[PDB]
Design a protein around this ligand. Structure first.
Ligand SMILES: O=C(O)c1cc(C(=O)O)c(-c2[nH]c(C(=O)O)cc2C(=O)O)c(C(=O)O)n1
Ligand SMILES: O=C(O)c1cc(C(=O)O)c(-c2[nH]c(C(=O)O)cc2C(=O)O)c(C(=O)O)n1
Ligand SMILES: [Ca+2]
Ligand SMILES: [Ca+2]
Ligand SMILES: [Ca+2]
Ligand SMILES: [Ca+2]
Ligand SMILES: [Ca+2]
Ligand SMILES: [Ca+2]
Ligand SMILES: [Li+]
Ligand SMILES: [Li+]
Lengths: 452, 452
């Protein structure tokens, strides 16, 4: 899609909802879920706390704090995945992922791993216990961790794991592994370094499903590959798997996740269109003193090999359902009209989640078959319509709830007339006038929006 | 997708197949089908003949000649749709569409109508009889008739009817009706003027299915709207409906046809990307002497209103699964290489059909879940892989069978190792070196390609 302008974002104020801030100054609140007890459960990524919030009183209880979660103040690591077992009344399990020290690493510079872990909820003591590591030794870094964890209708865990930030910023010269897949020898050794930029599908005990797709002759936990930072993952009522993903300077994506698909990253951003992005592989640069011009690969410094999207030899490439947004090669990624933090005007929205709106007895008019996609950078939540079979999007991503907030997650109440949203505690967001602020209106908040 | 170069088309010679001409004396052969008698049935668009060819021996019989078919030598009209009833042994019906004079028209700029008609096949005399008009008074013109007629798994007729060529060439100043839908009064009066640029879904008697979608508050025969020239329509084994469509100077499309969808034409070519196309509505130019610069709306003469794709207020807009091809605004539609016909270098392929390859006992390796899309202008048949659920394309459209021929239709044998192709009698095609020829290697032929 074509970017919206600052004025188009500014007017999306959702006057048809009442806003009530339930809590603020949460410590990097990250995921929220409607609990089996009809309370709001949310995670604090930085502290590893799992909080249960009564939405009417805002009363909070720290149900559990995941011990030894590792979080860096300037990082996206910490407590990430969070899901309830779908049959919680008979299987009172919570599944998480998080960043933990990796004792198998003596290197003090990539010191952590990601672990997918199950806890058991004890209703008598109202806490979590009996941890079981389901899958350990997963990559970890400060960037592009993703970590959305959902349980599918097939009773498998689906887990997004980002590309770790390779090929940008602090990890510029590390080779991006989104396209790489494990050999059998690596699987035998539990060497999961290729589990970057993937959607994994795991049995509930963490084992590899025998019916997972094959990539390069090997079935692993990988379900799909070629992702950058896939923070959103949600099943539709008819069993399809929708996803949102953050692109680089362009081409955030809404994807339909299909078994064995290749979502193209880093070779392809968005559509395979050679439009506004090319793959500049800094790990293959002539030397490490080269600078990233940060022009999305369209213009690069000498010495970094660039591959057009159309030059990539890909297999099973799956294009996005929708890009937020796609631009042409003439696009100026250094456009100063937004101010001197030019990225704010980049044709992206930084989607942080993806939520399938299920309606209910108070369903919001017109919202059938919608996907809600919060935006960190634009301070909106997008509503994306699909057809009733969830086979295509209809029309464009409609912005809602414009504010100076980095929206991090969204759910709806069972009745469907109330949305609950998390916001980041700190960061930059685009103001109504298009410029950047790091003054967030509701830092680290749980907000409810009630349809009038 | 990004256009292939002439060199990339030239190399797609399919040396792994043996070519044999079965019939070489056909006049404007248009559709071909594998019939319920395991013979190949094909139509001749201008003569109205329906021929049956024995695939083993190549003997051919004219089964029927549809009387009073109207065809213009400079036109795409004539005998178009052609399908068998799916339970032919018990319901020996053939369904056609064709151009016939409209005695309710009293001028000869648009003197004809399209009629969807059923015939009963008489096996004892090997002919068609008992014509029944199922839907008459449909639009007709010389351009963009489409007319693919298939019977879906739901036992309904699906019929593509193009946009009649409005807003280009001889029909430049007629308002394109692809977005227009009938009022209840028009519909009740059998006024089908809005049945342009549509996929229709009809009951087998021509009536309106009670579960057809609604557009603008009216349930009509329209199933989808917003099409330009949808020449290909084919159901997949799991009941999805794939389509190919000719775009203007760009953005031929492979579409997934979803009930009630709006495929965007003429406001949107391909993706809603504002890239390489804009909608210049010549019918809205006050000055009817204005010239069409034929730069895809990106460059226009003074006096024609232009709407960007992103400026359209659309409902239920469904983007294509694949474009052949999309280019940026900097693209030069007058780039020399094709001579006085710079339009053969246009980033399109002119798809003429869409065929779901079903494999079989001798299925071609790697062709699982492919859609075969013949190209008129490039003299290739594209192979487009989809995932096993036919939810997305995988990778790119792979050209095959490069020759100086305008490929008009394709089917495969039941075992899957033979492809049968029709070629146009006349027209332009791109040569290996990228230039244009109107010397076709196999004018008006039925050809078979057998995997080696
Ligand atoms: O403008 C853009 O494209 C853009 C903007 C942001 C933004 O939010 O400011 C981000 C981002 N996402 C997270 C996150 O926690 O998900 C953190 C950051 C960050 O830059 O600090 C990204 C990206 O990571 O791709 N792209
Ligand atoms: O280069 C392009 O875009 C292009 C090329 C052709 C071509 O075949 O040469 C056509 C076309 N299609 C048919 C048909 O029978 O379907 C007839 C013609 C014609 O030009 O006479 C179209 C189009 O009608 O969009 N576009
Ligand atoms: Ca980004
Ligand atoms: Ca992608
Ligand atoms: Ca791209
Ligand atoms: Ca065309
Ligand atoms: Ca379209
Ligand atoms: Ca377009
Ligand atoms: Li590796
Ligand atoms: Li009308």
């Amino acid at each position: 899609d074509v970017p919206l302008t600052p004025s188009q974002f500014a007017k999306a104020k959702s006057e048809n909802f009442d806003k009530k801030v339930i809590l603020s100054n949460l410590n990097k609140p990250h995921a929220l879920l409607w609990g089996p007890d009809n309370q709001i459960w949310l995670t604090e990524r930085a502290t590893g706390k799992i909080l249960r919030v009564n939405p009417e009183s805002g009363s909070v209880k720290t149900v559990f704090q995941v011990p030894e979660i590792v979080n860096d103040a300037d990082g996206q690591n910490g407590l990430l995945g969070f899901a309830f077992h779908p049959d919680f009344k008979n299987n009172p399990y919570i599944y998480i992922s998080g960043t933990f020290k990796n004792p198998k690493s003596t290197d003090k510079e990539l010191p952590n791993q990601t672990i997918i872990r199950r806890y058991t909820y004890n209703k008598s003591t109202d806490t979590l216990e009996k941890p079981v590591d389901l899958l350990a030794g997963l990559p970890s870094s400060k960037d592009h961790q993703s970590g959305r964890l959902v349980i599918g209708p097939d009773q498998k865990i689906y887990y997004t794991i980002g590309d770790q930030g390779r090929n940008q910023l602090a990890y510029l010269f590390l080779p991006n592994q989104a396209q790489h897949t494990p050999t059998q020898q690596e699987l035998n050794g539990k060497d999961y370094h290729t589990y970057m930029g993937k959607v994994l599908r795991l049995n509930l005990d963490g084992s590899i499903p025998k019916d997972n797709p094959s990539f390069n002759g090997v079935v692993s936990h990988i379900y799909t590959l070629g992702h950058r930072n896939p923070q959103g993952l949600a099943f539709t009522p008819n069993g399809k798997l929708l996803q949102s993903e953050q692109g680089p300077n362009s081409d955030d994506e809404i994807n339909l996740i299909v078994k064995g698909g290749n979502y193209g990253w880093p070779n392809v951003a968005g559509y395979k269109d050679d439009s506004g992005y090319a793959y500049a592989n800094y790990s293959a640069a002539a030397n490490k003193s080269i600078k990233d011009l940060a022009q999305n690969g369209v213009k690069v410094a000498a010495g970094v090999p660039v591959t057009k999207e159309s030059e990539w030899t890909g297999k099973n490439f799956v294009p996005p359902l929708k890009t937020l947004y796609t631009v042409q090669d003439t696009y100026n990624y250094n456009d100063p009209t937004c101010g001197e933090m030019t990225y704010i005007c980049w044709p992206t929205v930084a989607p942080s989640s993806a939520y399938v709106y299920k309606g209910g007895k108070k369903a919001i008019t017109g919202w059938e078959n919608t996907l809600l996609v919060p935006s960190l950078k634009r301070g909106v939540i997008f509503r994306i319509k699909l057809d009733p079979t969830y086979s295509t999007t209809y029309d464009d991503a409609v912005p809602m709830f414009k504010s100076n907030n980095r929206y991090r997650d969204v759910i709806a109440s069972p009745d469907g007339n109330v949305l609950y949203v998390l916001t980041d505690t700190a960061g930059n967001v685009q103001k109504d006038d298009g410029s950047v602020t790091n003054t967030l209106e509701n830092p680290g908040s749980l907000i409810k929006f009630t349809y009038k």
